[PDB]
Design a binder for this molecule. Structure first.
Ligand SMILES: [Cl-]
Ligand SMILES: [Mg+2]
Ligand SMILES: [Mg+2]
Ligand SMILES: [Mg+2]
Lengths: 231, 250, 244, 226, 243, 204, 241, 240
C-alpha cells in the first residue's frame, strides 16, 4: 500500500510487497512440472503461444551436460539466471575439473536473487525455476522462487493451475520414485501429471516440451514430433 | 550503501527564497550574542560563554578560535558546525596559501575561502547549509586591521563594528552611537564589554565572557628568538583576570 | 530510498518552462539594480548596494562590481556567494586563453563559457542553478566596446544599454527614452545615475549606497583603462551631475 | 655539509655550517641549514637541499595543524614519525638526511633520520659529508651531564672540524639552543672565522666603459588614467 | 507520520520502525534454539513439512562457519544465508591475518557491526532474521543471539521464531534445575524436547527435527550435525516427553 | 642530450644602493647551431623581474605559467606581488614537479615596494632557494660568472656604477662560453624607474 | 514534512532527527556517573540483566578503547558498539601516525566531528548514543569528556547521563559547592569509587548489590573495569560506616 | 552521480518531459526554411520586445556548422549552443577521419541522435529545441533541408517552419509552395520566405533575418535594407 514502492521497504507486518508482486508474475506464467526417480529426473512444460500465427515460447534451458531448468514468469529474467548458472557450472569444470552439485547450484541462485531484495534501485527477479540434474549423489529436483527460497523435492509444479499437478504427484509419490531404469515410464508419469493442470486446451505436438537427465543420459530437450510418442 | 543523495537539498521556492538558507539564519538568530569592534590600532571580538551545566568546565570549550597567528574567529549559532569550520579554515589557510606563498593569507582571502566552503554546502548534493554566522577579525601588512561577517549563504561583508545572534539588533544600535574612527584598542574593548553586558542575563565576569584581540605583535608568545623579521602573533586571547581588571573601570 | 526527497531541479513544467530557472529569476528581481550603458568612447557600470548600514566599511567593500581581467568587468545581481564561484571560474578561463594563444580573451568567448556553465546546471546533475544575473562590460580589438547579460538559464544577449535586478521594467523604459547612438561616456555616466535615482526604492541616492565603474580608452593612447570608483569619487560625480 | 646535535643537562643543541655547493662550485657562502619545524622543534638537513627544505615545511605545516587540533604543543616524536613514514613511502627518492632536535612537555629529544626512513636516537649525532670529521671531535670530548655552555662549545667545535677538514663544508657556524622551560634561541652566524681579506685592487670601472646600442624606459606601471 | 516509510529515520520516540517491522518477519518464521552446555553448544531448528514431496533430511537449515562455529536463524531464509556468507568472509580474513581461528566473541561483533550497518542508511533494508550462533574457542563455549537492530548478547540458552515464548520457558527451567551445568549429550536430548514442545504454535503441519553441536569432548571443538542413531535417540526421548 | 645545455644562455643579478640589476644574453641554439639572437630571458610581472636559463621550451612555459599565476594573484589580492612572495611561488611551483622537473635555472630580482629593500634570489631546477645579498648567477657559463662577480662586485654601488659592473661580468663570462652571447640586455631597477640597455658585443 | 525525516533545517532552524536521536539515548533505562580524584577518574553505570537466559558477563556498556582511555555509553548497544569500534580504530591510528597515545579530549573531539557530519550529511543518520570518555591524561591529568548526537562536546569536573541525570547532576553540584574544589580530594581510587557509588545511591534513592553496578577506573597509564567481587568489597566498605 | 530517470512513460504511453520540451519550442521565436531549385533560404523572427539591443554582438539565430551547412532553431537559446558545439566538433571529426565534409543528412542524423540520447539517459532532461538544418552535400547541387525535434525524430522537407505561430506559416507554405516548380531563383525563394514570415512577424523592420545558402559553400546573410526592399515590394503588390 504505502510500503510497496520499492524492495527496500518492510510493511508493518514484516512483508516485502515487491517480492510478493514478483511472485505473482510466476502464477500468471504457463504450467511446468518436475519429477524424479533414483536414476532419472524429468521436466515437462506446457508452452504458450501468442496466437495461431505465432510460435510457442520455449520453457526449458540447458545449463550443462548434467543440469538444466524450466521457467515460469518473466522469460528474460530466466535467461539472466540461466546464464549465471551456465557460468557457475563452467567455472567449476574449468577450475576444479568438477561437475557442479545441484544443491550448490541452488545455493548460488538463492544468494544472487537475495541481493536484489535488500538494495535500493534494483528489483526482484520475476521468474520461477525448476532445476533438474544428475550429479555424484544421483538425481535431483529443485524449485527456485525469486524471494530467494530454493527447495529440494521429489516432484513439483509451478505456474497457472499448478496445484492440480502438485496434488497428483503427492498421490503418486510412492509409484514414480520407484521408476528406475525406465525413462519412458517416468516421462509418462510427468505427462499425466501436467494433464491435471489443463483446461479447454490439450497437449499437442508443438504445445508439449519435455527434458530428461539421468545415469547415462545427458540433459536433452524434446520438442516437435519427438514428443508425439507421449501425446 | 553509497551516498545516493547526489541532488540539491536547498532549492528555490516559487517566491525566489532559498528555504534552507533562511532556516539556517533562523538558527543563527537563536544563538548566543557575539560581536566585533575595529579600532585604529586593533580589533576586538567577544562573546558569552553560555555554560550548559555548572559541572561542565567551560574553559575546555573555545568559542573564540585562532585561525592564523594574525586572524581570529567567533560565531553565533550551532557550535558543532563552527568547530568543523574552524578545522577546515585552519587547513585551507595552509593548503591553498601558506604551502604556495610561504606566508599566511590576508584576512579578506581566508574569509573568501571559508565563504566558498559555506556556499558549497548550499548547492552541493545531499547536504544542508552550515547553521552559523562567523565574525572574523585579522591583520595583514598591506590591508591593515579588518573585520568580516560570513553568513550561511556564503556572503561576507566588512564591518567597522557589528553584532550577530540573539540581541544583535539592539547591540548594533548601541555600537552605532559609540563608534568613531579615532578609537584606540582599549576604548574598543571598553565599548565591547559595555555592549555585551546588555545581552547577558546572569553572571558577568572573566569566567563567563570570552574575549580576544588582534593588536600588536607579541614576541613573548612566539616561542623562539633569533629571527628579527619574526615578531610574534597579533592574535591574543585575554585572560579571566585581564577581563575583570577592565570590569572595575567599567 | 533517497528518491523520496529529490526535488528534481532539472525538469520542464507542462508549459515547457524550467521551474528552478524561473524561481531563480524571481530571486534576482529583489536584488539591487545594476545598469550598464555602452558609448562610442567607453562603457559605464552603475549599481545600487542593498539597504546598507552606517557601520559598514564601504571603502573595502565589494558586492556588485568585479574585475575579470584588465579589459573585462562584471556587475552582479543576485546571490553574491554564487556569483563569486562563477567569477573565479571566469578569471581562470581568461588566463587559460591568454596562456594558450598569447592574446587577451575576446569578450564574447568569456561570456559564452560562463553561460554554458549556467546552462549545465539546468539540464543535468540534479543541483540547483546559480541565482545570479551578470552584466558584462568589456573591450577587445574585434568588436570594440561590448555589453552582455546572462541569467540562470545560461542564455546571453548583447546590449547598447541594459539593467538587471530590481525594477528592470521601469529602468529599461527610461534608458530606451534617453539613449542615443552618438552618446559619449560623460553623458552615459549621467544617464546611469539619473536612471538609478528614479528607480531606486530608497528615499534618496547617496554615495554610500552606490558602486560605480568605467571602461575608457581614456587611457594614454591606444589602450584601455578600468576605473573602479572610490567612495569619495562617487560622491564627487553625484555633485557634478547634480543629484546631491 | 656538516651538521651535529648534542644533548645537555636541561635541553639539546644543534649546529651546522653555512656552505651549499653545486659539484665543486660554492653556490651560497652563507646558507641557512637550521630549519624550524615548530617554535621549539628545529632540524638540520643534509643531502638534496630542496628535499630537506620541502619535507621540513610539509611536516612543519601538518605539525602546526595538529597542534591547533589537539590544543597541545607539538612533540618531537610526532615530527619524527611523520617524517620517517613520508620518507619511507618515497623509498629514498626524497634525498633528505635530517637531525631532529627539540623540547616539548615530555622533555628534550634528539633523533636522526635517513632518506630511506630509518631513525636513530642518541646523545650526540652528526650527518653530511663532514660527519666523520665532526664525529671524531664528538667521540673525543663528549661526556655525560654537559652544561649548556659546554654543549654549545662542543657542537661548534664539531662543525669547525667539518669546516676546516671537509671540502663540502665551510664558512660560518649556525647554532640553535633548545632548553626546557625556555624559548629556543637561534644563533645565526654564531662563529664567523672565514671573512675574505681586502682585495689588492678596486675593480670599479669608469662610466661609459661599456658599449651600448639602445636605451629605453621600461613601463612597470599599470595602464594610466585620462 | 511517515517515519516508518524509510530505514534509518528516527521517529519522535527515538525508534527505527523499519527495524521493528523486520522483527515481525522473524516472529513469523519457524522456531530455532540454542543451548550452552558444559564444554560446548547445541543448535536445533523446526523444519515445517509443507508437502510430502519434500525430500527428507535434504533441505538443511543449520550452517557452519569456519570449522568451529554453527549458525541457525528464523525469518527470511535468504537473509540468513547472506549473513552467514559475510560471516564466512570475516572468519577467513581474521584467520588469514592472525592465524588462529576467530574467537566467538570476536565473530559475534563482526556479524553485529554488519547488521547494524544496515540500519544506518535508507538505501538498504534491515535483516529479516534473528540469528543464534556460537561454538568453542580457546576460552571455552559461547552462545550468542543477534537481532535485526544489530543487538546481540551472550546467552545460557536462546530461542527465536513463532514458538519462542514456549521455548524460552523450557530453557529457563533447565537453567534453574542445573546450576552446575548440562552435558553435551543431555543438551541434544533437551534440544529435541524443546523443539517438539515449541511445535504447538505450528501444529497444523508436521515437521522435521534438525540438530547440530560443537563440544570439546564429543566433537573435538568442531561443528557437526547430529545424525543416525544419536538423532533417533533424541527423537524418541522427545516423543516420550510429549506423551 | 643534457637538457640544461641544449639551448645555452646565462642570467646574472646584483644588488646595489637602493637598486638591483638583472642581465641576460640573447642566444638560442640547437647545440652548435645558433638559431636566434633575440631570445630574451628576462620577464617581469609588475615590478618583480624573473630571469630563466636552461631548456628554452621550459623557459617559455614557465613565463606563461607565472604570468598566469601572478595575474590571478593580483585580481584576488588587489595588489602586485612582491619579490619575497614571488620567490616562494617559484619554489613551490618547481618542487611540485619533483620527479619530472622543468630543466631551468630561475633568478628573481626586484625592490619591495613598501620597505624599499633590494632583493635577489636564485633556484635550482627543483626549487631550492639561494637568497644571496650580493649576486646570483645561472646558465651554461655560471662558473665564469661566479669568477667575474666574485672579483668585480663590491657592496653599495650606485645605479650607474652597478650597470658597468654587471655588464662587464656578463660580457666577459659569455665570451668564454660557446653557447652564450649573440647580444645582451641589462635592466637597472630603482623603486619607481627601470632602464633597459642593449649591449654591443662580439657576434661569434 | 520531510524536514523531520532527514537532517535538514525546519522553519524554526531545528534538526528534528538530532533531537529524536537524543531520545533514543534513554532507551536502555540506564544511568551513568563520572567523577575525578587526585590521581584517577572513576565511571559507574547501572547494570540490568532482565532475562535469566542471558550470560550476565557479556552484558556491558563500558568499553576499553585504548590502554589509557575508557568509554561508557548511554544508548542502544548496536550504536554503542559501532561507536566503540570506531573509537578503538581512531585511537590506534593516532598512535601510529603521531607517535604518542591519543589524548582523551582529542578522541572526544574526533568522535564529535564524526557526529557533526551525520547532522549535516543526509545519507547518514545520527547515532542514538551519548559517549563519556575517561582517562588520566599525561598533560591535563584526570579527564572527563562527553559527546552527544548533535556533535557537541565539553570537559567536565564530574558528569551524569541517563533518564535520571538531573537528580545525579544536582547532587554532584551541591557537593562541589561545599568543597569548593574541582575534584574528589582522595588518595586511593577505591575511595573515589566508594564516593561515586554513595552519591548515586543518595541521588537515585536505591540500594545496589554487586550485580546491579558496573565500574570503570582510569589511572596513570591504564584503564580497567572492576569484577563483581571487587565491587562487593566496595559495597561492604560503604555499609560499614 | 545523479542518475534519476526524469524522462519516463506515463500510463497512456506518453513521455511528458519530451512533450513539455516541445512546449518550450512552441514558445521560441519562429524559424522557417524554404528550398528553391538551386538554393535554400533560412528565415528567422526577432521579437521586438528587446530594443537597446546591440545587434553586432548579440548571438545570431542562424549558425554555421561548417562552411557548407547551417543550423537554425526554435526553443531554449542556451540549450541550442550545446547542440551547435557538438555538431561543429563532429563536422571537423568527420573531415579528419573520412577526409570528406559531412552530408547534410549525416549532420542531421548526428544532432537528432544526441537529442534522442537525452530522452533515455539518467539524470538529464531533453533539449527544449527543434532545429532546421540546411545546406549542400560536397560536390552536389541538390538543395537539402532537414528538421529535428526533442524526441530525436528527423525528416527532410521541401519547406518547413518551427516555433511560435508556426501553424499559421505552415498553412501559408502548404498553399503557396508548388513541388513541381520550386522557387527557380534566389530572389523568388527569399521573397516566398519573407512573405511567409510577414503572416506572423508584426513590423518588417529589424524583426526578420534572412540567410541564403547556395552550392559550394556560398553562404551570406542579408542586411536590413536588402530585406526592407523585399518587405516594400510585397505590400505594394498587396495593395490591389
Ligand atoms: Cl576530525
Ligand atoms: Mg660565445
Ligand atoms: Mg661561434
Ligand atoms: Mg544525516
Amino acid at each position: 500500500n504505502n510500503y510497496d514502492g520499492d524492495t527496500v521497504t518492510f510493511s508493518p507486518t514484516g512483508r516485502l510487497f515487491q517480492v510478493e508482486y514478483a511472485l505473482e508474475a510466476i502464477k500468471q506464467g504457463s504450467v511446468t512440472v518436475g519429477l524424479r526417480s533414483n536414476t532419472h529426473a524429468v521436466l515437462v512444460a506446457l508452452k504458450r503461444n501468442a496466437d495461431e500465427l505465432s510460435s510457442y515460447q520455449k520453457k526449458i534451458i540447458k545449463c550443462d551436460e548434467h543440469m538444466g531448468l524450466s521457467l515460469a514468469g518473466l522469460a528474460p529474467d530466466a535467461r539472466v539466471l540461466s546464464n549465471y548458472l551456465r557460468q557457475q557450472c563452467n567455472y567449476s569444470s574449468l577450475v576444479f575439473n568438477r561437475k557442479l552439485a545441484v544443491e550448490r547450484a541452488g545455493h548460488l541462485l538463492c544468494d544472487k536473487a537475495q541481493k536484489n531484495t535488500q538494495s535500493y534501485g534494483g528489483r526482484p527477479y520475476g521468474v520461477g525455476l525448476l532445476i533438474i540434474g544428475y550429479d555424484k549423489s544421483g538425481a535431483h529436483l529443485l524449485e527456485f522462487q525469486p524471494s530467494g527460497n530454493v527447495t529440494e523435492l521429489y516432484g513439483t509444479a509451478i505456474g497457472a493451475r499448478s496445484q492440480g499437478a502438485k496434488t497428483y504427484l503427492e498421490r503418486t509419490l510412492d509409484t514414480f520414485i520407484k521408476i528406475d531404469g525406465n525413462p519412458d515410464e517416468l516421462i509418462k508419469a510427468g505427462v499425466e501429471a501436467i494433464s491435471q493442470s489443463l483446461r479447454d486446451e490439450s497437449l499437442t505436438v508443438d504445445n508439449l516440451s519435455i527434458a530428461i537427465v539421468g545415469k547415462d543420459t545427458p540433459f536433452t530437450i524434446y520438442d516437435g514430433e519427438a514428443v508425439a510418442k507421449y501425446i | 550503501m553509497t551516498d545516493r543523495y547526489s541532488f540539491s537539498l536547498t532549492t528555490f521556492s516559487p517566491s525566489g527564497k532559498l528555504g534552507q538558507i533562511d532556516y539556517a539564519l533562523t538558527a543563527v538568530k537563536q544563538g548566543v550574542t557575539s560581536l566585533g569592534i575595529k579600532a585604529t590600532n586593533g580589533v576586538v571580538i567577544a562573546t558569552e560563554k553560555k555554560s550548559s551545566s555548572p559541572l561542565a568546565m567551560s574553559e575546555t570549550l573555545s568559542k573564540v578560535s585562532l585561525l592564523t597567528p594574525d586572524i581570529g574567529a567567533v560565531y553565533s549559532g550551532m557550535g558543532p558546525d563552527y568547530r568543523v569550520l574552524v578545522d577546515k579554515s585552519r587547513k585551507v589557510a595552509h593548503t591553498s596559501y601558506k604551502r604556495i606563498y610561504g606566508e599566511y593569507p590576508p584576512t579578506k582571502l581566508l574569509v573568501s575561502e571559508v565563504a566558498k566552503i559555506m556556499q558549497e554546502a548550499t548547492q552541493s548534493g545531499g547536504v544542508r547549509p552550515f547553521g552559523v554566522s562567523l565574525l572574523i577579525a585579522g591583520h595583514d601588512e598591506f590591508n591593515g586591521f579588518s573585520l568580516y561577517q560570513v553568513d550561511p549563504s556564503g556572503s561576507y561583508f566588512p564591518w567597522k563594528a557589528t553584532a550577530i545572534g540573539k540581541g544583535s539588533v539592539a547591540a548594533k544600535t548601541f555600537l552605532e552611537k559609540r563608534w568613531n574612527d579615532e578609537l584606540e584598542l582599549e576604548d574598543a574593548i571598553h565599548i565591547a564589554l559595555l555592549t555585551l553586558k546588555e545581552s547577558v542575563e546572569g553572571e558577568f565576569n572573566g569566567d563567563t565572557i570570552e574575549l580576544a584581540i588582534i593588536g600588536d605583535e607579541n614576541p613573548d608568545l612566539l616561542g623562539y628568538t633569533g629571527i628579527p623579521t619574526d615578531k610574534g602573533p597579533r592574535f591574543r586571547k585575554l585572560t579571566s583576570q585581564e577581563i575583570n581588571d577592565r570590569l572595575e573601570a567599567l | 530510498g533517497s528518491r523520496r526527497y529529490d526535488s528534481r531541479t532539472t525538469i520542464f513544467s507542462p508549459e515547457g518552462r524550467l521551474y528552478q530557472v524561473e524561481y531563480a529569476l524571481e530571486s534576482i528581481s529583489h536584488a539591487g539594480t545594476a545598469i550598464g550603458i555602452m558609448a562610442s568612447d567607453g562603457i559605464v557600470l552603475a549599481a545600487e548596494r542593498k539597504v546598507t548600514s552606517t557601520l559598514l566599511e564601504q571603502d573595502t567593500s565589494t558586492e556588485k562590481l568585479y574585475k575579470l581581467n584588465d579589459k573585462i568587468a562584471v556587475a552582479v545581481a543576485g546571490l553574491t556567494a554564487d556569483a563569486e564561484i562563477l567569477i573565479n571560474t571566469a578569471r581562470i578561463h581568461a588566463q587559460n586563453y591568454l596562456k594558450t594563444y598569447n592574446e587577451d580573451i575576446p569578450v564574447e568567448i568569456l561570456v559564452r563559457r560562463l553561460s554554458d556553465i549556467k546552462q549545465g546546471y539546468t539540464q543535468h546533475g540534479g543541483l540547483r542553478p546559480f541565482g545570479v544575473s551578470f552584466i558584462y562590460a568589456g573591450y577587445d580589438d574585434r568588436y570594440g566596446y561590448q555589453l552582455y547579460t546572462s541569467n540562470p538559464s545560461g542564455n546571453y544577449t548583447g546590449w547598447k544599454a541594459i539593467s538587471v535586478g530590481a525594477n528592470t521594467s521601469a529602468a529599461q523604459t527610461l534608458l530606451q527614452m534617453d539613449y542615443k547612438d552618438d552618446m559619449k561616456v560623460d553623458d552615459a555616466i549621467e544617464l546611469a545615475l539619473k536612471t538609478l535615482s528614479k528607480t531606486t526604492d530608497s528615499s534618496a541616492l547617496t554615495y554610500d549606497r552606490l558602486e560605480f565603474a568605467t571602461i575608457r580608452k581614456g587611457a594614454n593612447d591606444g589602450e584601455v583603462y578600468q576605473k573602479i570608483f572610490k567612495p569619495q569619487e562617487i560622491k564627487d560625480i553625484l555633485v557634478k551631475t547634480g543629484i546631491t | 655539509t656538516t651538521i651535529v646535535g648534542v644533548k645537555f643537562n636541561n635541553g639539546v643543541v644543534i649546529a651546522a655550517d653555512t656552505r651549499s655547493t653545486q659539484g665543486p662550485i660554492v653556490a651560497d657562502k652563507n646558507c641557512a641549514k637550521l630549519h624550524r619545524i615548530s617554535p621549539k622543534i628545529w632540524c638540520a638537513g643534509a643531502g638534496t637541499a630542496a628535499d630537506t627544505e620541502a619535507v621540513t615545511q610539509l611536516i612543519g605545516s601538518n605539525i602546526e595543524l595538529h597542534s591547533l587540533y589537539t590544543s597541545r604543543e607539538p612533540r618531537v616524536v610526532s615530527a619524527l614519525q611523520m617524517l620517517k613514514q613520508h620518507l619511507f613511502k618515497y623509498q629514498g627518492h626524497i634525498g633528505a638526511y635530517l637531525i631532529v632536535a627539540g623540547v616539548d612537555p615530555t622533555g628534550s629529544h634528539l633523533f636522526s633520520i635517513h632518506a630511506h626512513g630509518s631513525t636513530d636516537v642518541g646523545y650526540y649525532l652528526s650527518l653530511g659529508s663532514g660527519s666523520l670529521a665532526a664525529m671524531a671531535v664528538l667521540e673525543s670530548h663528549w661526556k655525560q651531564d654537559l652544561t649548556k655552555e659546554e654543549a654549545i662549545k662542543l657542537a661548534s667545535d664539531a662543525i669547525q672540524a667539518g669546516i676546516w677538514n671537509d671540502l663540502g663544508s665551510g664558512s660560518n657556524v649556525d647554532v640553535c639552543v633548545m632548553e626546557i622551560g625556555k624559548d629556543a634561541e637561534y644563533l645565526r652566524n654564531y662563529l664567523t672565522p672565514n671573512v675574505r681579506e681586502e682585495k689588492q685592487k678596486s675593480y670599479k670601472f669608469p662610466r661609459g666603459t661599456t658599449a651600448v646600442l639602445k636605451e629605453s624606459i621600461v613601463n612597470i606601471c599599470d595602464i594610466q588614467e585620462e | 507520520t511517515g517515519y516508518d516509510l524509510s530505514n534509518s529515520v528516527f521517529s519522535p520516540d527515538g525508534r527505527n520502525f523499519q527495524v521493528e517491522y523486520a522483527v515481525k518477519a522473524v516472529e513469523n518464521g519457524t522456531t530455532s534454539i540454542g543451548i550452552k552446555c558444559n564444554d560446548g553448544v547445541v543448535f536445533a531448528v523446526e523444519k515445517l513439512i509443507t508437502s510430502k514431496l519434500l525430500v527428507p533430511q535434504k533441505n538443511v537449515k543449520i550452517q557452519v562457519v569456519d570449522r568451529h562455529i554453527g549458525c541457525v536463524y528464523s525469518g527470511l531464509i535468504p537473509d540468513g544465508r547472506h549473513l552467514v556468507n559475510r560471516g564466512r568472509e570475516e572468519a577467513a580474513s581474521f584467520k588469514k591475518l592472525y592465524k588462529t581461528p576467530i574467537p566467538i566473541p570476536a565473530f559475534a561483533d563482526r556479524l553485529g557491526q554488519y547488521v547494524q550497518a544496515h540500519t544506518l542508511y535508507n538505501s538498504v533494508r534491515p535483516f529479516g532474521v534473528s540469528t543464534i550462533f556460537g561454538g568453542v574457542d580457546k576460552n571455552g563455549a559461547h552462545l550468542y543471539m543477534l537481532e535485526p537492530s544489530g543487538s546481540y548478547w551472550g546467552y545460557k540458552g536462546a530461542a527465536t521464531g513463532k514458538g519462542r515464548q514456549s521455548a524460552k520457558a523450557e530453557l529457563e527451567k533447565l537453567v534453574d534445575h542445573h546450576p552446575e551445568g548440562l552435558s553435551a549429550r543431555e543438551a541434544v536430548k533437551q534440544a529435541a524436547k524443546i523443539i517438539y514442545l515449541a511445535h504447538e504454535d505450528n501444529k497444523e503441519k508436521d515437521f522435521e527435527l534438525e540438530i547440530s553441536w560443537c563440544s570439546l569432548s564429543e566433537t573435538n571443538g568442531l561443528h557437526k550435525f547430529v545424525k543416525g542413531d544419536l538423532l533417533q535417540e533424541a527423537i524418541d526421548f522427545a516423543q516420550k516427553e510429549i506423551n | 642530450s643534457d637538457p640544461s645545455s641544449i639551448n645555452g644562455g646565462i642570467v646574472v643579478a646584483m644588488t646595489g644602493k637602493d637598486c638591483v640589476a638583472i642581465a641576460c644574453d640573447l642566444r638560442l641554439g640547437s647545440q652548435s647551431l645558433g638559431v636566434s639572437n633575440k631570445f630574451e630571458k628576462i620577464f617581469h610581472y609588475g615590478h618583480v623581474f624573473l630571469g630563466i636559463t636552461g631548456l628554452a621550451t621550459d623557459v617559455t612555459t614557465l613565463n606563461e605559467m607565472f604570468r598566469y599565476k601572478t595575474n590571478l594573484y593580483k585580481l584576488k589580492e588587489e595588489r602586485a606581488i612582491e619579490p619575497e612572495t614571488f620567490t616562494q611561488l617559484v619554489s613551490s611551483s618547481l618542487y611540485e614537479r619533483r620527479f619530472g622537473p622543468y630543466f631551468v635555472g630561475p633568478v628573481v630580482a626586484g625592490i619591495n615596494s613598501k620597505s624599499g629593500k633590494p632583493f635577489i634570489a636564485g633556484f635550482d631546477l627543483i626549487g631550492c632557494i639561494d637568497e644571496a645579498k650580493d649576486f646570483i648567477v645561472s646558465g651554461t657559463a655560471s662558473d665564469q660568472l661566479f669568477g667575474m662577480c666574485e672579483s668585480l662586485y663590491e657592496p653599495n654601488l650606485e645605479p650607474e656604477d652597478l650597470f658597468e659592473t654587471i655588464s662587464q661580468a656578463l660580457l666577459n663570462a659569455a665570451d668564454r662560453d660557446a653557447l652564450s652571447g649573440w647580444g645582451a640586455v641589462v635592466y637597472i631597477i630603482k623603486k619607481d624607474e627601470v632602464v633597459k640597455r642593449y649591449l654591443k658585443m662580439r657576434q661569434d | 514534512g520531510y524536514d523531520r525525516h532527514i537532517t535538514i533545517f525546519s522553519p524554526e532552524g531545528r534538526l528534528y532527527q538530532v533531537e529524536y536521536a537524543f531520545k533514543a539515548t534513554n532507551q536502555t533505562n540506564i544511568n551513568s556517573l563520572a567523577v575525578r580524584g587526585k590521581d584517577c577518574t572513576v565511571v559507574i553505570s547501572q547494570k540490568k540483566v532482565p532475562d535469566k537466559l542471558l550470560d550476565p558477563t557479556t552484558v556491558s556498556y563500558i568499553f576499553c578503547i585504548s590502554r589509557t582511555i575508557g568509554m561508557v555509553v548511554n544508548g542502544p548497544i548496536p550504536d554503542a558498539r559501532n561507536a566503540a569500534l570506531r573509537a578503538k580504530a581512531e585511537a590506534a591510528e593516532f598512535r601510529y601516525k603521531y607517535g604518542y597515545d591519543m589524548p582523551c579530549d582529542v578522541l572526544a573531539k574526533r568522535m564529535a566531528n564524526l557526529s557533526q557530519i551525520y547532522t549535516q550529511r543526509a545519507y547518514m543518520r545520527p547515532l542514538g548514543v551519548i559517549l563519556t570518555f575517561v582517562s588520566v591524561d599525561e598533560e591535563l591529568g584526570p579527564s572527563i569528556y562527553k559527546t552527544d548526537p548533535a556533535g557537541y562536546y565539553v570537559g567536565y569536573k564530574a558528569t551524569a547521563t541517563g533518564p535520571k541525570q538531573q537528580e545525579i547532576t544536582t547532587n554532584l553540584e551541591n557537593h562541589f559547592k561545599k568543597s569548593k574544589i574541582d575534584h574528589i580530594n582522595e588518595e586511593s581510587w577505591e575511595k573515589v569509587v566508594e564516593f561515586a557509588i554513595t552519591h548515586m545511591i543518595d541521588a537515585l534513592g536505591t540500594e545496589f548489590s554487586k550485580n546491579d553496578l558496573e565500574v570503570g577506573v582510569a589511572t596513570k597509564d591504564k584503564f580497567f573495569t572492576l569484577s563483581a567481587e571487587n565491587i562487593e568489597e566496595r559495597l561492604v566498605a560503604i555499609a560499614e560506616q | 552521480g545523479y542518475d534519476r530517470a526524469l524522462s519516463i512513460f506515463s500510463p497512456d504511453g506518453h513521455i511528458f518531459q519530451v512533450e513539455y520540451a516541445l512546449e518550450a519550442v512552441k514558445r521560441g521565436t519562429c524559424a522557417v526554411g524554404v528550398k528553391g531549385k538551386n538554393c535554400v533560404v533560412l528565415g528567422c523572427e526577432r521579437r521586438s520586445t528587446l530594443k537597446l539591443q546591440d545587434t553586432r554582438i548579440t548571438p545570431s539565430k542562424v549558425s554555421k556548422i561548417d562552411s557548407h551547412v547551417v543550423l537554425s532553431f526554435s526553443g531554449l537559446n542556451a540549450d541550442s549552443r550545446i547542440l551547435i558545439e557538438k555538431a561543429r566538433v563532429e563536422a571537423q571529426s568527420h573531415r579528419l577521419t573520412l577526409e570528406d565534409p559531412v552530408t547534410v543528412e549525416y549532420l542531421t542524423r548526428y544532432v537528432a541522435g544526441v537529442q534522442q540520447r537525452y530522452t533515455q539517459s539518467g539524470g538529464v532532461r531533453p533539449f527544449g529545441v527543434s532545429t532546421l538544418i540546411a545546406g549542400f552535400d560536397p560536390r552536389d547541387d541538390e538543395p537539402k533541408l532537414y528538421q529535428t525535434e526533442p524526441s530525436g525524430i528527423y525528416s527532410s522537407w521541401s519547406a518547413q517552419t518551427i516555433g511560435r505561430n508556426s501553424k499559421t506559416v505552415r498553412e501559408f507554405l502548404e498553399k503557396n509552395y508548388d513541388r513541381k516548380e520550386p522557387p527557380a531563383t534566389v530572389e523568388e525563394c527569399v521573397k516566398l520566405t519573407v512573405r511567409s514570415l510577414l503572416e506572423v512577424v508584426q513590423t518588417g523592420a529589424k524583426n526578420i533575418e534572412i540567410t541564403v545558402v547556395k552550392p559550394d559553400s556560398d553562404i551570406v546573410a542579408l542586411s536590413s535594407e536588402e530585406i526592407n526592399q523585399y518587405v516594400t515590394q510585397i505590400e505594394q503588390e498587396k495593395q490591389e
